[PDB]
């Protein structure tokens, strides 16, 4: 559908921001686990990958339709801890706040696009 | 990635955290006679550099080495 193509980029950006938000909050929650590595995703590359499949064929009514079913990069440690935990509070707190801001911005842009498509139709 | 202000202030936070860590490690090892091997502990210092950045006028703080 052409409607999907217009809203594909913002929807994928919003979903990627939510996933990275979950990853950052997991990093915050597991700050005290000894031996836990701080993981993160490269937002731009994954957004390229998602923006850039074959539903199995259903011959009749009984035939069952096809059933549907990101890469994590390690953060470079800054300070060496003794328990092997590489999670840094300041870095991930700033990243968490930034991701929240960008999620809000994506919501704003997507809502503006939908509202414009709506006022085009209203009459 | 980060917004410019976010990057600058977060770099400032990380640099201050590194300086505080160096100070705490020095204060802990104030009375140490021998280190991992047999050599005396040497007080560490942290050197602040300004992230050159393409803008130059605006830039955070980085730490080259201890």
């Amino acid at each position: 559908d052409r409607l999907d193509a217009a809203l594909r980029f913002q929807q994928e950006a919003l979903n990627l921001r939510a996933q990275r938000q979950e990853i950052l909050a997991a990093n915050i929650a597991n700050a005290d686990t000894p031996g836990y590595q701080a993981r993160d995703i490269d937002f731009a590359s994954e957004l390229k990958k998602v923006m850039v499949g074959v539903a199995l064929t259903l011959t009749s009514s009984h035939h069952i339709p096809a059933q549907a079913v990101v890469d994590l990069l390690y953060r470079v440690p800054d300070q060496p801890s003794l328990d092997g935990n590489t999670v840094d509070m300041d870095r991930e707190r700033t990243q968490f706040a930034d991701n929240s801001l960008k999620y809000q911005m994506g919501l704003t842009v997507l809502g503006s696009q939908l509202k414009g498509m709506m006022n085009v139709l209203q009459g | 990635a980060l917004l410019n202000i976010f990057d600058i202030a977060g770099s400032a936070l990380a640099a201050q955290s590194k300086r505080l860590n160096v100070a705490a490690s020095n204060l802990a090892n104030a009375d140490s006679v021998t280190g991992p091997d047999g050599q005396p502990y040497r007080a560490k210092q942290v050197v602040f550099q300004v992230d050159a950045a393409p803008g130059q006028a605006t830039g955070g703080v980085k730490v080259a080495s201890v």
């Binding site: 590595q37 390690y74 470079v76 840094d88 | 990380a14 991992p36």
Partner: peptide, 21 residues
């Protein structure tokens, strides 16, 4: 390279021995 970058490799384990091995 820079502290806070992104790499595809986990950091080596953080060992701190008390005596020289």
């Amino acid at each position: 390279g820079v502290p806070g970058a992104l790499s595809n490799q986990p950091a080596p384990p953080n060992e701190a021995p008390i005596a020289t091995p």
